[PDB]
């Protein structure tokens, strides 16, 4: 039961009428932010527009990433989701903009269905060109097959009387084992005999699996699932990630459009979330203007706890939240407010409860006072050491003396800075 700074957020807790309550879904306060977030939730649920931009901005310890996780959880698993940090964009194998596009194409999902054809049964004979003979529980069929999977079977050390499993669509070959009809041939044979399969050798099934566009693009450009010697021999030659031409994206778009027009698939827009976007370079920032103003780009959400700052990559322009006005114009802004004392106390007690800790009311008052004095994250971090300190004295509850002892043991930012200022050698 691992808990880490989250998992107490079970959703925005918004009413069906679009009015958020005070305490619900592991959330307290931020009524305006929650209402706007639910509005954006219904926006993406509409699945009619594309390339919309929302930025939420506020100081630290204001649950911005918590809000992003909340909207992601409220949307559910049907919609694709991919959290991101700004620093992850910079790579050495491919240019930054190409990685941005790669993450763009991974943020939209496609629900597809197809028929899987398989042939399974007992190995009867192997006549070279290649014809094979399969024996089932009741049926029996002979199959002519490509020499590639024949050689794969040879590599799979398939013997006589064995039972195998073949996927017709992909040519996947797998041997289940050998039939128990001829099993006790040896006293201590290493091969594990398995019972004969039941049913016809020919079988058809249906799947409903889901894929994203980036998966289709990388599958088309890079085949990395081969079985015969030529396949993996070729695919091991170029391990490095390369660029992806735009014409490949256009071809993939055409084929998925044909698939959905025929009526065996439908498109699912998704959400791309970039956290701490203040550090992004100017080139990526001006690339976002072109990337967003497109036809397929999904909605995007940004986070930045900044003010009058210079964006990285330049040295002149001072812009709010570290975002130049050009990207600001195509942006929606959500304001997050700092908390207050009673909300701090409620947060602390809720975090204690989700950590299954017993806390005495005076200890909660001390924790709230200290959190207002220094920060909420400080108290949230140090509550667990208080719990273990109480556990050392074999007490399941939290006492004020224990909290004071823990605060003595572990420092905060202001005390450490004050010690550093009066220090012998930059302690």
């Amino acid at each position: 039961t691992r808990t880490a700074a989250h998992t107490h957020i079970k959703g925005l807790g918004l009413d069906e009428s679009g009015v958020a309550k005070r305490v619900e879904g592991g959330f307290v306060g931020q009524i305006e932010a929650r209402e706007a977030c639910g509005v954006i939730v219904d926006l993406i649920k509409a699945k009619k527009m594309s390339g919309r931009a929302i930025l939420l901005a506020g100081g630290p310890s204001t649950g911005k990433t918590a809000l992003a996780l909340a909207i992601s959880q409220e949307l559910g698993p049907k919609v694709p989701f991919c959290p991101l940090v700004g620093s992850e964009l910079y790579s050495v194998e491919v240019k930054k903009t190409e990685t941005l596009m790669e993450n763009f194409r991974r943020a939209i999902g496609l629900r597809i269905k197809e028929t899987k054809e398989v042939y399974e049964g007992e190995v009867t004979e192997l006549t070279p060109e290649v014809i094979v003979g399969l024996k089932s529980a009741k049926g029996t069929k002979t199959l002519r097959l490509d020499p590639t999977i024949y050689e794969s079977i040879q590599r799979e050390k398939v013997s006589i009387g064995d039972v195998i499993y073949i996927e017709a669509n992909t040519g996947a070959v797998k041997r289940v084992g050998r039939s128990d009809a001829y099993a006790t041939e040896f006293d201590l044979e290493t091969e594990e005999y398995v019972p004969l399969p039941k049913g016809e050798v020919h079988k058809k099934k249906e799947i409903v699996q889901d894929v994203t566009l980036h998966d289709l693009d990388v599958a088309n450009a890079r085949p990395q699932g081969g079985q015969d010697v030529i396949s993996m021999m070729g695919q091991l030659l170029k391990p490095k990630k390369t660029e992806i031409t735009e014409k490949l994206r256009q071809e993939v778009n055409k084929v998925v459009a044909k698939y959905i027009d025929q009526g065996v698939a439908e498109l699912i827009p998704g959400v791309l979330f970039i956290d701490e976007v203040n550090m992004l370079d100017i080139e990526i920032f001006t690339y976002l203007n072109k990337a967003l103003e497109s036809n397929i780009a999904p909605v995007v959400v940004l986070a930045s706890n900044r003010g009058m700052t210079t964006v990285r990559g330049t040295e002149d322009v001072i812009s709010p939240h570290g975002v130049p006005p050009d990207l600001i114009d195509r942006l929606l802004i959500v304001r997050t407010l700092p908390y207050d004392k009673d909300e701090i106390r409620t947060i602390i007690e809720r975090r204690a409860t989700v950590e299954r800790l017993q806390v005495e009311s005076s200890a909660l008052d001390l924790l709230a006072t200290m959190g207002t004095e220094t920060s909420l994250r400080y108290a949230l971090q140090l509550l667990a050491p208080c719990g273990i300190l109480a556990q050392t004295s074999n007490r399941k509850e939290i006492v004020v003396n224990d909290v004071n002892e823990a605060k003595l043991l572990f420092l905060d930012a202001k005390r450490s800075t004050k010690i550093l200022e009066t220090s012998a050698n930059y302690l």
Binding site: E151, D215, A219, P223, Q224
Partner: protein, 97 residues
């Protein structure tokens, strides 16, 4: 022919195979017996890790396009490679362990 291909290359210049053999020659009789386990060649390393690769290799690709696995090495029913070269490729490569 005498003035073009009689002897033009066997005049050293760059190199000569006998010189390479004289240089790439070896003055060692036998050493590193513990090649056994001191070196532990990776061909033995992969098979020594059989159980973990059976118990851990789980993930599969989400999508794959057929006719590109074979086309990657430039051999298809309509390709630019030679007639017997394509078959000799895997005739030399199928025997690989």
């Amino acid at each position: 022919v005498n003035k073009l291909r009689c002897d033009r290359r066997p005049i050293f210049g760059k190199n000569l195979i006998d010189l390479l053999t004289k240089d790439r020659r070896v003055k060692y009789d036998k050493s590193s017996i513990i090649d056994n386990e001191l070196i532990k060649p990776l061909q033995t390393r992969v098979l020594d890790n059989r159980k973990i690769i059976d118990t851990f290799a789980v993930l599969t690709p989400s999508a794959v396009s057929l006719d590109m696995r074979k086309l990657a090495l430039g051999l298809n029913d309509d390709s630019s490679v030679g007639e017997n070269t394509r078959l000799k490729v895997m005739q030399n490569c199928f025997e690989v362990s």
